[PDB]
Amino acid sequence: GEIQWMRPSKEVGYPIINAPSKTKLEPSAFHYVFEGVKEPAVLTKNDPRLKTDFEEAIFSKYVGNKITEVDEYMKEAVDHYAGQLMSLDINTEQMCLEDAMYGTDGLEALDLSTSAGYPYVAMGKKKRDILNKQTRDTKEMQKLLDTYGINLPLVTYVKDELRSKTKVEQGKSRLIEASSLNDSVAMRMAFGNLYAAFHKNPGVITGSAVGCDPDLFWSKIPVLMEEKLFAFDYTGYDASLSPAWFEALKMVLEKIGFGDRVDYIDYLNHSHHLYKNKTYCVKGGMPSGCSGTSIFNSMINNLIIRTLLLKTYKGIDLDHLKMIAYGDDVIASYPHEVDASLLAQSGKDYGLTMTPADKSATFETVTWENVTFLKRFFRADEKYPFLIHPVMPMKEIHESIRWTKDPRNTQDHVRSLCLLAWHNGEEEYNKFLAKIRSVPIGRALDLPEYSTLYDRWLDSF
Ligand SMILES: Nc1ccn([C@@H]2O[C@H](COP(=O)(O)OP(=O)(O)OP(=O)(O)O)[C@@H](O)[C@H]2O)c(=O)n1
Ligand SMILES: [Mn+2]
Ligand SMILES: [Mn+2]
Ligand SMILES: [Mn+2]
Ligand code: NA
């Protein structure tokens, strides 16, 4: 990922983009009943908390493009991955404009809360103005596509969320690169069935966990993995991807019946962006707000791990590489132990910055006791060990509950934290409910007791 040029959007006919300068995150009824150190992320250049330029920080994520061509190892990675995906008989057809808009099995309907993106964002028209769940009317959309045409600029917003103090002082806020409703609809028609096949098959065949339900999936993972587990996290995964990784991706798409629209992958790779009043062009890097961002990142991840393994352990048997990825996050395994640190080294050569799984000091053996996937641990249930508990640390939950964006969604927000928390055991869960009910707001919420949740879980399989 690298920015080729950036300049005043007026110099090229683009309207300045308005983005609220004030966070929507305010302390919640539970702010002083729980401990937390995170605060809202810097949204503007003026934030008094800053200790460096906001611009130099939000964009520094584009470390550059380390590789130029797709080498032999990547090519082999491609062939093998494309091989597995082949056993899914992925319907290679296109998706009728309707389904792409209002869903179908394996794919949800478009989200009405996310930006409509350019031009609509600068014209004033929202997503409710075009779509309409009731009739599934293609017309308004179908018309708008012809008017403004696909492959449209991405609107860049700073993400309004909680972040550690350091990441606040160093201006390490995160950006949201939003695609026009058009682009998003085009892609969902182009790759719609691909998405559906992935959503319906989380596991080691797709090597993706997208669309998964942790309460059920965690019990299916251990069985899918090989004897030895290995893991690591990337730093700036999305923005570090070089153009070559997108080409490898197109090669996979080509091999499974999508050579047709591999062009779309080109816009993810070489993209046009609008942030505030400035405009820039980015070579490489996966944008965050596109249709498929999540899935395409997982496919590339499947290519990366394969590549690093082929270049570090000539003769490794990829047929016994059992991995599952969710964008940058990944959990993998092999019949034999491997050196994650060594793999990390090869990673740099491919433009990836890999470090010990879970901010550890150094690479240490990965076990079922210490491995995490999506911030969650794996813990077999006391009474029935064949059922695995996806365990989200309480700290994460404590951090989330101390803040709010809308008092109206307090019920749903806390209920959600409850569905994550109870896996930490009945004792912990009850303390959590107790503190919640130690203030007026909490006592008025309808929260499920432990027994109710644990029983529902047991019968869900
Ligand atoms: N709108 C956004 C922006 C970024 N990201 C994700 O957040 C990552 C960066 O977040 P942070 O966790 O803040 O950077 P990391 O380098 O991943 O953190 P660490 O150095 O601790 O590994 C990106 O690579 C991307 O996967 C996201 O999900 N949505
Ligand atoms: Mn990370
Ligand atoms: Mn981080
Ligand atoms: Mn991560
Ligand atoms: Na890009």
Side-chain angles (χ1 to χ4, degrees):
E2 180 181 69
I3 304 171
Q4 303 309 296
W5 49 262
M6 180 200 285
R7 67 179 188 177
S9 302
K10 54 188 174 182
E11 284 179 31
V12 302
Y14 281 123
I16 292 183
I17 292 295
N18 292 299
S21 63
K22 184 173 196 174
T23 161
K24 291 209 173 190
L25 289 169
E26 49 180 50
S28 58
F30 314 89
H31 200 164
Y32 307 85
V33 210
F34 293 108
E35 314 188 320
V37 301
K38 293 187 173 174
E39 308 156 41
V42 176
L43 295 195
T44 73
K45 327 68 197 175
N46 310 300
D47 199 299
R49 288 179 293 176
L50 286 180
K51 293 196 167 189
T52 168
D53 205 74
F54 187 52
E55 311 281 294
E56 175 178 57
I58 53 179
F59 289 123
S60 63
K61 64 169 179 175
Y62 292 116
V63 304
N65 299 309
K66 199 69 163 55
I67 69 178
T68 302
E69 239 75 60
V70 176
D71 65 30
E72 52 173 288
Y73 309 104
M74 289 166 65
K75 285 183 182 171
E76 213 184 315
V78 171
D79 284 35
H80 183 259
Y81 189 44
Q84 293 187 181
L85 296 182
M86 210 70 73
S87 67
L88 288 171
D89 244 297
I90 298 181
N91 181 307
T92 72
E93 279 187 296
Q94 181 137 293
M95 185 151 272
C96 84
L97 176 57
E98 191 182 303
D99 283 332
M101 289 173 66
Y102 314 91
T104 169
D105 182 35
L107 175 60
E108 290 186 323
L110 287 141
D111 186 54
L112 301 176
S113 59
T114 47
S115 181
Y118 200 92
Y120 314 75
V121 71
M123 299 189 298
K125 211 169 181 182
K126 297 78 175 184
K127 286 192 172 181
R128 310 184 191 302
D129 297 321
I130 307 175
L131 284 163
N132 262 176
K133 69 166 186 177
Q134 86 295 303
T135 328
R136 317 186 69 182
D137 181 61
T138 90
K139 302 179 183 183
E140 176 67 310
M141 245 291 83
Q142 183 46 282
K143 177 186 180 181
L144 271 171
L145 289 182
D146 294 287
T147 307
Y148 300 79
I150 71 177
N151 195 158
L152 295 149
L154 300 171
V155 196
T156 295
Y157 298 111
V158 172
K159 200 181 184 188
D160 186 27
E161 55 170 358
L162 291 178
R163 304 285 289 170
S164 65
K165 182 65 176 179
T166 306
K167 290 178 180 179
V168 168
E169 283 169 356
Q170 297 187 300
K172 294 298 183 187
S173 299
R174 306 200 311 213
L175 321 172
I176 292 182
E177 283 104 33
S179 77
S180 94
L181 175 70
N182 280 55
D183 292 316
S184 186
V185 182
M187 298 199 71
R188 296 175 54 111
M189 282 204 280
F191 302 116
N193 311 293
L194 175 64
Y195 300 153
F198 266 58
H199 289 162
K200 299 190 54 190
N201 291 291
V204 294
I205 297 309
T206 65
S208 129
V210 180
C212 105
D213 167 19
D215 287 330
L216 294 177
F217 200 52
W218 254 231
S219 285
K220 284 176 180 181
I221 293 175
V223 185
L224 299 183
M225 297 289 96
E226 289 292 338
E227 186 58 49
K228 302 289 176 184
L229 308 176
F230 66 100
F232 41 60
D233 349 286
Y234 304 78
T235 295
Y237 179 83
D238 280 51
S240 60
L241 292 179
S242 288
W245 283 117
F246 291 87
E247 287 306 318
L249 178 54
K250 296 165 63 181
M251 298 182 171
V252 167
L253 290 176
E254 195 283 317
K255 295 177 187 285
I256 60 172
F258 295 75
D260 255 313
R261 42 284 190 208
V262 297
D263 304 63
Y264 288 124
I265 303 305
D266 285 321
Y267 195 27
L268 297 156
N269 176 45
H270 216 179
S271 57
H272 192 196
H273 300 199
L274 298 172
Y275 163 69
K276 261 60 176 176
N277 60 324
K278 295 187 167 192
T279 189
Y280 56 94
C281 180
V282 177
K283 177 193 191 185
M286 181 67 95
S288 50
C290 286
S291 223
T293 278
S294 193
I295 273 170
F296 291 138
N297 272 319
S298 293
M299 286 175 66
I300 288 185
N301 214 321
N302 267 283
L303 292 181
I304 288 170
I305 304 299
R306 280 173 175 70
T307 289
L308 306 188
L309 282 173
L310 288 169
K311 173 155 190 170
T312 298
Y313 300 119
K314 174 170 186 173
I316 195 152
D317 185 5
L318 297 184
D319 279 4
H320 276 301
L321 163 61
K322 287 308 165 187
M323 58 168 281
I324 302 175
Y326 189 71
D328 59 310
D329 212 308
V330 47
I331 187 173
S333 64
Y334 194 59
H336 302 286
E337 183 176 305
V338 304
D339 193 325
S341 178
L342 221 207
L343 287 182
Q345 173 184 287
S346 311
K348 288 169 185 177
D349 299 316
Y350 288 89
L352 303 160
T353 287
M354 302 154 67
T355 68
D358 300 359
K359 298 177 175 283
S360 305
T362 51
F363 295 100
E364 305 310 316
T365 301
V366 172
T367 53
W368 282 124
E369 199 286 327
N370 64 191
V371 74
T372 60
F373 186 46
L374 290 171
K375 297 178 300 176
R376 305 171 168 70
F377 286 78
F378 300 67
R379 291 286 185 278
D381 180 65
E382 284 175 47
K383 293 177 59 205
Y384 308 75
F386 48 91
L387 301 180
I388 314 296
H389 280 298
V391 183
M392 167 89 95
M394 286 307 298
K395 180 176 182 182
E396 295 298 307
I397 298 173
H398 284 160
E399 290 282 0
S400 170
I401 202 166
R402 296 162 73 278
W403 306 82
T404 176
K405 292 183 168 191
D406 192 322
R408 295 177 292 182
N409 306 313
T410 291
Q411 171 63 60
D412 297 317
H413 179 196
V414 182
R415 179 86 180 187
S416 290
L417 297 174
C418 282
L419 304 184
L420 300 177
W422 79 270
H423 290 291
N424 274 282
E426 168 165 48
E427 172 149 338
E428 279 289 301
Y429 188 61
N430 288 316
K431 293 180 179 180
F432 180 59
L433 281 193
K435 292 181 190 157
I436 292 171
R437 287 153 177 171
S438 79
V439 313
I441 286 304
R443 287 185 294 267
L445 306 174
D446 181 37
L447 315 174
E449 295 302 310
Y450 189 81
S451 81
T452 301
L453 290 177
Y454 174 53
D455 285 359
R456 201 159 68 192
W457 189 60
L458 298 181
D459 306 327
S460 60
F461 297 105

